[PDB]
Each structure stands twice: as structure tokens, then as C-alpha cells.
Amino acid sequence: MEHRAFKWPQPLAGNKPRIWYGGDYNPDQWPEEVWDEDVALMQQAGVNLVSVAIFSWAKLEPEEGVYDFDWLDRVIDKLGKAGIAVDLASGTASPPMWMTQAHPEILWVDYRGDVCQPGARQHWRATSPVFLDYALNLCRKMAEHYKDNPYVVSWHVSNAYGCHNRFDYSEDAERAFQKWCEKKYGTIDAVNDAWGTAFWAQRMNNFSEIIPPRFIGDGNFMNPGKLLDWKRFSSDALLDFYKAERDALLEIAPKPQTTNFMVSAGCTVLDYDKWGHDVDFVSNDHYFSPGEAHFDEMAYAACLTDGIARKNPWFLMAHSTSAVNWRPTNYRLEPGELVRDSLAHLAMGADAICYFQWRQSKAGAEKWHSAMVPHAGPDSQIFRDVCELGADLNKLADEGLLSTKLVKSKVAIVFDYESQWATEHTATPTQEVRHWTEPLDWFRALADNGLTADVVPVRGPWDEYEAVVLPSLAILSEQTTRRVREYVANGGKLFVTYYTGLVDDRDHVWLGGYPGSIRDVVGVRVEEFAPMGTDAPGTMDHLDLDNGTVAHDFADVITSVADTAHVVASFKADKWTGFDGAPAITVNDFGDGKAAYVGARLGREGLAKSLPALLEELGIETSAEDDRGEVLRVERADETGENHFVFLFNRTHDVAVVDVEGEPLVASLAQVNESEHTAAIQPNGVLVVKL
């Protein structure tokens, strides 16, 4: 896999490079006189880019073969005249009513054969030929019309593919899946082997016997190999649609182009790292996680985004000023979080900061979603903070932040979309264990130990790092196995955890003892698992460790430890459980490297407490200060190292005090003491320094 060449949206003629600042703009939802008020307010706020026409198909093509562009010409002109750049959409995110009325075969079909209707959005099949013809047609009309518009700086292709239409079970999907399987496997016997079809009379004579994983009765168990391929296929079918639209636009109007991802700790609707290879620049939608996890999970997701972009600058396409509309309980943001959240994504390497949306809708299903201009209007704390943020971004651009990169960490935490899919089967050891939670737990625990990790997709250069975490990385292919073995052999410092390396990329178990492909590297052998929980009276729901930590949900049964290895921590338990004195945490010497195995789920807190002794043995340096977990430190720098920025975020509900090590440029809820060269950072506060 090669990436496309990097391309970034360029300034309007006569403008200098800025951190792009703005949001989705939907003037089609407002009387025309509002657009001038919009433009005045945008200039006040320091907004310099908006994303237009994303769901405007029914206005752009109001009946088949009739096109209406004048309204959009006029808004683009207003914006451009005022010095505001337009990120223009294909307009193909969701079809108009006329089209699905005429062609119901466009509508995706669920696992039971029920047809998703219009009434919301993105109700189209990824593999519909009819819908592709309509999408490519609008793409060509749009590219033809805006080819020479100097105010349009980039293409926003469709919108968040697969958010609603990830899975289709129609005849189109059935045929496409068959062809996808022929292309991957060549022969039906290679499919029979991969999926283990000798089990339960599933063996197929030919590729026409491959059906999608449709309804099989509630609570019954689908073929796991097949269901993993179904997820890979579904991602790939949408990726092919993206490529088609992308290609139809660029053939006519070559401009920097992206499509917006949905990278967050727990969102795996697509293999976003694979998709990263086909965008010109990575753009992402991220919304805060409610409660205590808000800051850490956002910094993590932004970190992953940077990792998908291979440390190139990236584009925050969407986040919220305050509440969203789509949770059961739509918590608002607290004072300071607007500025802080935006500066967090920026610190993780974004050169653009954009919201959904500019102006809060007064009608429709997202009327309750926050905006930059709330229902309350610009006499509001939200808009004041938006303007403050505008001025902050202008300041950081002035001081040279643009094109700097997220500094390389000591530690790469590995993420694999496919490993997450493997852990989603309904007949694994426990539904309570998925891939995705572990890398996040480790990011938080390393931050508690004063270390900001990088998060690196499994295809990416994790093997170039001082230290690497494999966090519940269920899949290890032959290839990844070899990369792991050699990494350690040649000086690598590895952490491996439970639920890592169970299977290969066909979802076949590595035999002989878990983790079956790398027992030599970790220096342990696991014969079986001990899932934990509380779903009946008297189930085992925890295991204490002799290092003052407690395991929940899952523990390995380690039955041997190599001679090159030693036990760092052991379980304490009732004798009849088998776990008393059993190994929990181990470190192994392998070539010139070391590998630690963490044989149970310890959570953030457990990991955080377990880590000092492991980091010491593996030779990973951190601060000794007991306050090192209070702030998250995030650095951007150019290649020289001359333009070097440090972002410091309070992670706590206490006042955090830090050294100021340069010129302070931005201070949200932070007060510097010039003479003592110190700063007190309030809760939800941030200080930005240039070294």
C-alpha cells in the first residue's frame, strides 16, 4: 500500500497560510438576508473556511436532470469576497426523494430483508449500480460548474461514509461479496479453508453458494471467519465508491480532496487506516465522550488521527461547541472546554479546526445540536469563546505553528481495525473484552506516568519506536508476527497483553498455547482463559495481584514461564480457584530486547500503578515528580526543531502548577507568574508555549 501524495487546501489569492478555522455552513436552511449576517459574524470570529453543500442534493438537482446552481454561486461569491474559503462538497451524501421514489433498488436492506426508507440520511447501498450512476453524474456537474471558481479550495467528498450504510444485505451486496471473495481467495476451496466450513455442514461447492451473513435466528452464531470478511468487504465496498466519486471530480477539477473520517476510541465502521491511503489529507469528525473520559479519549483519538496521517498535518472537519443531539443524554460542555478541546486536536497535529456547525438549525433532527452561533444568537458565551478561539489560532499561525508535526513519542500503541472486528464475534471467551478499550487504557496509564504515547496503526512504523504496546491485539498475521519477533530481537521494548495474538488473519487459532505465534518472544505459555463477571450469584468477578492491583473481566492461565523470563507480579486468590501464586505479569529477555506480558485486564488505574517497575526494567525514562500525571504534555516541532511548541493540559479537577519553559502564547484558564516562571492551570485549562 502506497499513500497518495500529500495535498493541503491552499489560501485564497492574496491571503497568507492560516490555521483553517470554520465549520459546516448550510445557508440553504435560511432566508437569503441571513447570509450577510453570517458573513459579518464569521469575520468577527476569525472564520476563514466553511464546508458547503454537503446535503444539498435536493436543492442542486431538484428533479432528475434539472440543475440549480445559482443560489450556491451567490453564497460562494459572498464568502470569497469577504476573504472566506470554501471547501465544496460533492453534494452526494444523501439522495433526494424523487430519486428513491423512482429507484427503490437504491435503498439498503437489513439482515432480515427489511428495506431502509428515506426519512433521515445515507439510505443507499454501497454496491448499487444505479446510485453510483446518479452520484458520478452530480459529481461531474459540480466539478464542471466549479472547476474555475477561485474561491473553492478543496473537495469534501460525500459525508462520513458508512455511518448508517456500512452494512447492506441486498442482492447487489450478495453479488459483490461473492466477487470480492473470488478476488481475495481465487478458489472456493481457499474460502472453505479460511472460513472453516467443514464445521456445521457449511462447505460450499462454488462461489454462488456464498451468501451474506443474513438473519439466522436471534442468539444463534454466525461463521466468524465469514463475518470478519463481511466487515472487510463492507469497508472495501464503500472505499471503492469513495474512489469512484473522488476520481470523477478530479478528472474535471483537480483540487485537494478528502472525505471525513469518524476516528474515535470505539468507532470502527471502516478500516480508517486503509482509507487514509486514498485521501489527499486526512480529515476527521470527533465528538467528546461524556464524563471523566472526555479529555483523555479526545487527545487519544486525535493522536490516532495523527497516526493514520503518518504525522503529516490533518484536518479536524467536525466537533461540537457544546452539546450534541444524538446521545440519550446530551451533556453540555463546561467553561473553558470549547477552547481547550480545539487546542487539543491542534496539539495532536491538526492544521485546521472546524465545527458542526456554523449556525444552529431551528428545525430538523439536529436542531438540538450545538453550533458556533446558537439559537441564542451571537450574544452568547459560545460565540464569545468561538471568537476568542479565532484570535488564538491566528496568533499561533503568526508564531509559526503551521506544518510542525506531532513529536515522535517513546512509545507506540498499536491499533488494528480488523483486530477490533475479530473481537466482536458473539462466541468469543467474553463479550466484555474488545480490542479497542485496551489501547486507550494504556494511553491514559502512560499519561499518568508522565508519558504521552503515540498511537500507531498496525501497518504503520511502530517498529521504529523505542517501545511498543500490543493491546488486546487479537490478530497477528504471519507478517506481523515476524515484524514483532524481529522488533524485539534487535533491541525493541515490547508490552503484550491478554487477548493478543489469539488468531491469524483468517481467524484461525494459533495452536500449542496462547499467544500461539509468539510464545518465544513473551516467554510464557497460556493454556486457557478465566473470564470474570457478575452475571450469576457467586461468579468470580476479580483477581487481586500482589503488586496492589485488581484484575476484572479477564485473566490468562499462564502455566509456564521461560528460563529467560521472570515474574514481576502474581495473582492472590482463594485456593480452589487455581489462581493463588499464579503468574500475572512477566518480563522476558529475547535477543537484545525485552517483552512484558500483562496477563489480565488491569484498567487505567491498575496499569498506571503496575507501570513504574516495568518501565524501569525496560529502560524507559520518565519524570520522578509525583505531579507528572496531572498534565498532558503534547509537542509539535518542525524538522529543524526551531519552531517547537509545548501544549500543557490539566487532566484533573485540581489547580495544576507547571514550569513555563518558553514564551507563553495562549493561556486558557491559566495564569502565568512571570518572575517565578510558573503557571497555575485551572481545571479544563491549557497553556501553550514556544521554546
Next chain:
Amino acid sequence: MEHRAFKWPQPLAGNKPRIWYGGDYNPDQWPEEVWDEDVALMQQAGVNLVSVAIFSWAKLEPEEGVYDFDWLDRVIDKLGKAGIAVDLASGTASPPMWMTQAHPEILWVDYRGDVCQPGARQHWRATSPVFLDYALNLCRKMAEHYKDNPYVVSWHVSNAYGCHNRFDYSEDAERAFQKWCEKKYGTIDAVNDAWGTAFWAQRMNNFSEIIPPRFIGDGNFMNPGKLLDWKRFSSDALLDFYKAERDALLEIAPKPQTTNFMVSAGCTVLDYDKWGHDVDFVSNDHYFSPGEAHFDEMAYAACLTDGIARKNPWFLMAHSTSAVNWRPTNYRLEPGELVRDSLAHLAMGADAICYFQWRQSKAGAEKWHSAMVPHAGPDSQIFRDVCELGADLNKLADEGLLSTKLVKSKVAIVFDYESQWATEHTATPTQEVRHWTEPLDWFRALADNGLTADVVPVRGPWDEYEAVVLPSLAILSEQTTRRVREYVANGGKLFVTYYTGLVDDRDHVWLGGYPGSIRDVVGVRVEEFAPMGTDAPGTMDHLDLDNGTVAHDFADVITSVADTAHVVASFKADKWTGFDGAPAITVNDFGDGKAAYVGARLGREGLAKSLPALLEELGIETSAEDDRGEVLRVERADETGENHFVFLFNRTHDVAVVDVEGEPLVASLAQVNESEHTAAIQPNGVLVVKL
């Protein structure tokens, strides 16, 4: 109802009778070189029977009308020559893809009309004539081919009927249900009366107006008499299918034949006692209940299996060496439980001990289900315990265990599949009360008081016992009523609980006060119920009793007690409830016997504490020992008494001390003190002795 003559699978020429030991064997999932390792490991383990071809249809008939037997002939010859017998499947458990592609009408239909697809197993309609054709054809091909094979000791017809295909709502089912109703009732007027169809305008003019209980809207209320008959019909249709396959194998290849049941405390997909009349020997699958109930519920289930078998030896077709795959959290087994669990089924009368499965699948939906040979291979604690168990079963057969029977208890606990169905309606007094939990509660509480009960299906000879429990036995027919009355009148000691005798076998309520067919027998009259729970603030969630116990979920409102009866325990409550000082537990003198009435759910704990007084009133003797409930004592003996075995299982997490009353044969996590003639049984331990 007649049972079939008992037949048991016989040894291979030249072998002595043994406790059949082994499991499901799936060579078709492995390279043929692996079969040699399998056979060597089976011999090391003392395995002497395997169950083959259960899901092998796609290999035996890889296309319509093409048969491939050679692989199977070879595997069978490898086994038989190594002294391992073969329980051969009909292969008809689940159809291959080519068959359902060609004949979609085979596929069962859910209540909403959505067709169950292939992708897991058993996706066929019980009443499909085309599927019957295919299944009988393969039966005959297999019978014709293996009728003179001397290594095939029995037939395993299909597999676990109804586990996935209990209910079908297709046109086939509709027509079959009409004919079923006409056979049972004769006239549409008799159906109308049974189902109470004057209510809600449901009266039918003819049999063509009967439809299955299909979708009526979420939360709406099906006609209860029809639903009960639907569950009766569903079990009967699968039974007719089983009999057709059976008769087709046996007309060609008369060998001993069974089909595996799923008897456990809570599983009632079929009337397994009824199905018990059509097997030659009873076989069963049972998997452990997680947590505290593991040991007790397994013993209870084994006990019920023995009851269904009418005290003939029976075949444990499946259980697990450790974790299963199909729970949300798949807990492992603790040290010693492999052996103990097997010995529990044995103590309760099994002459065969078999596992799912011999070797752990490395691919497919049950890859995480434990086995006799784990992924880790034969160098494993599981394989060592499998080998130790094999030796123990050889030892026990050498000492004369075979064909001994579970000793007749003082107490029969009555179980009625149909009564559980009656309690399943959505408009009962409370969804918290079902038939099934009460017999289990009584079994455990009787064990707390040092008595091992028998569990006897309602059709079975419970009226021959010293004492009898009717536990939430919601149906009492006229015939069962007469049997209960005559039992007590002639000297029986009866325990009757709440939710007993509400309805007849048509689900019509017995009028005049509950329980309305037997008020004279129990000497009480219930006017109404008081369900209890916590589903709004301030609901009544318990009622204390003056014997130091607490009722939950349900209490009866007893408003009169007969002159022949007296009150043993009363409720204590806030006065506004109406329950302060009301009767809770009574005893009535009726003819030469007694009937105790327990008018609330006391649970295991409350029943345990209540039982000393009740046992004394009813003249049922038990130990006086404080420690009488620490251990479950299970006994098997021949008709003479000459071979008399005692199994002693620790039920606790303490060391149980016991008296050794014969020769110790098997001691798992138990230590005999020779000279004191005592033994220390560790948690999860068991001692087996011959007197």
C-alpha cells in the same frame, strides 16, 4: 404411554462392558495425518467410544445424489482396530448449502415471517415434506452402508432437535397445526371451548381458521390456551420427525439408537419426558450453570435425566471440560471440577460419560468451546484430567458399577414440562414466577437438610414415594388431581406450593379459590395473590415470616384454614398490607396422610430453614447432624444390594469431613485417613466408596 424396550450400546467383539468414555469426534475438520495422533491420545486417555459424522452432511453428500463414504470408512476402521467403538450419527443434523439454495422452502420462518438463513445450523422446518425426503434418504444411504460394520455400536439420530428450530411459522407449520388440533380435539367447537375463544372475538367457524401465533404487535397478549397447544404441537412435530428418521435407520440397520436431549433445570424446548418414550436409551447434553449453582443444578439435572429414564442407566452425550463458547461470559472450570462433574452424572446413574468434543476446533463458531484436547494440545492440565478420569471410570467398572441404579429417594420432586409452558404466558400474575425454579429450590433445600431427592416427571411413579413435592406445578389435570388425592388419602406425605394447581390441562382456571381442584387436600383456600417486586418506588418487595424466613416475588392470600389443618408459620407485615398475622405455611391431615402448603416463594434459604419443622410434622426422618448439608450423598445399587456405591460431593468452599463406610475406590481432592475411617474432602472434591 409405553416406553420402548431398553437397549444399550454393546461392546466390540472381545471387549468387556465398560463405562463408555469419549466424545464428539470431528476428523473431517482436520488433515488425515492428525487422525493417527487422535487415536494414540484416545488410548492414553482411556477413551473407548466416539460420536462421529453428526454435522457431516456436506461431506457425505457433497452434491445432490452423490455420496462420499470413504473418508468415514477409513476413520471408523482406524478407531475400531484400536478398540474404540463408534456411535454413528445419521448425519442429518444440519443441511448443506446446495440443498437450501435449491429448496429455500426447507428454511424455518419466524413469527414476523422472516426466513431463517443458512450460516449457523439446524435451519430447517420440522414439518417440511421436502426436508423429510432428504433426511430419510441420507438415513437409508448411511444405514445401507454401515449395517454390517462391526465397529458401529449405535445410532445418534440427528442432534439436539429443537435447540434452534423449535418454532416455525411457515405455511407447512400452519397446515400441520390445523391437523394436530383436529386430531387432538375432533371438532372446532371443542377447540373454541378449550381456547376460550368467546373472549376478544376469536371464535372460529372451522379448522382452516386456525393460524399459528404469529406477530400480533410488541407487548400484545396471545391467546394462552393456543400458545400452550402451540408449544405442545412444536415438540410433537419434532418428535414425529425423530421417529421417521429412527424408523428409517432401524428398518435397514437395527442397532441401539438415541437422540440427545438438553435436560437442565431451565430448558423446556421439548417435553423431554414424553420424548423419553421413543428412545431406546436416554442420552443428554448438560453444561454447567456459572457461579454458586454449578454443582447443585448439575446434580439436579442428572437426577431429572435419571427420572426421565425411569431409573434405567442413561448416556451423558455431552458436557464441557472447561469453558463453553455460547455464554456472554464463558467462565472456565476450577481445578478438580472436570473429574467431579463427570462423577456427578455418573453418581446420578449414567453408564456413559462423553464430552463435546474430542479436539478443540481452530476455526468456526465453536472454536472457543473447550475440549478433551485443547488448542494448547495434550501437554495441558485439561488433557491430564481427561486421562485421570479415564482411569477412574475403568476402576469403577472393574468394581461392578455398571447397570447399578440410582437408589430410590424418600422424596419425589415432580417436574412437568407443560406446567413450565403454562407459566410462560405474558399475562400471568407475574413474569418472575415460572414452574422450573421451584423444584430446583426444593432439591437444594432438601440437600441442605441432608436428604437427596429424586426428580420425577409428572407421568412417572411419584405416587409410590414416601413424600412428594408439587413445586409451582401450575397445571393439575383431572387425572393428576385424582392421583394427588388418592396419594395423600392412602398415607402420602405431600408438599404443595404457591402457583400449584391454578389451571387444568386446557389452561382453564379451577374456580372456587386456589388451588381449586385440591382445596380439600391442602386444607386451605386462596382468594387472590400478592406478587411482589421492585419495579416502581414503594412497591411491596418482601413479606417476613414468623419462622425467621422472608418471602419474595409472590405470596398467596390464604383466607381460610380447614378444621383438619393448622398454621405452622404466619406472615409479619405493616398492617395496611393486609398480611400481618395471615397464614403462610400450613399442614393438613387428609385421610391417612398429610399435605403441607407453602404459600410463598421462600427460595433455597427460606425452604432450608422452614424444612426441619415440616419434616417433623410429616414424619420424614433425616440426620440430626449440624454438618448434614455440607455434602451431597448419592447412591447406586443393584436389585440385590450386593453392589452398592456411595458418592460424596462437597457442596461448599470449606473442607468437609466425612465417614468412610466401605472401600474407597476414587478420591478426587479428597484424603482418606485409613485408621480413623474418615476423609477430608476439599472444595470441589469427591469420594466414591463401595460398601
